Amino acid sequence: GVEIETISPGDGRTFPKKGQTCVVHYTGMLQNGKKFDSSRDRNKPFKFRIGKQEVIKGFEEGAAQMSLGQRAKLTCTPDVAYGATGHPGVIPPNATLIFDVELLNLE
Template structure:
């Protein structure tokens, strides 16, 4: 009797777990959806003439700055502000200092495009920013926009 009950419970649990589907979003689907959202955002904001990098990040060099550009191991000092595509501001800081290789992937891609004194607008898909986890202020899978002024580069 115990064996029959155990076999029945085991079989039932196998059937239930096989019926459950993985509810995690498909990364390719998220990327396509975000790219569409970015294109819609840009269409609604014709004052922005962003270029799409092969990584998927969009950027607009507002001012190129002058001098050398940062390498991956450079420590940079920036002023920045961040917002969601909806326009909700989530973060900003003046005189933020950090090693470029430790920062968001979209920043690693875009900041080397300008020199000290330059400014860049970055529209980043979630996979190059805060990803599927998000933060307390940023929902998961959120496209984010940064306005960054590069103040100083230490190679």
């Protein structure tokens, strides 16, 4: 279950399809309020291909429901993103992940 709560409105007609790149200037957080990732401290936007299983399952089912220029807030459940062993050193096991994704250009 991915809960997509919007933050700023977008275009509402351009949505990502298969085999298409996206650029996403996200910043990820935990449930407690501690930030574990940001793509704006590096000033380099994250770019990924949809459908080829680069990102986690919660990220792409989260990025597919948005529009161009829309900025939303996801709450990825721990079942869909790093369930048992997690990522060692960053995210504790069985932790809820929150993402403030923003799609800049190209669907």
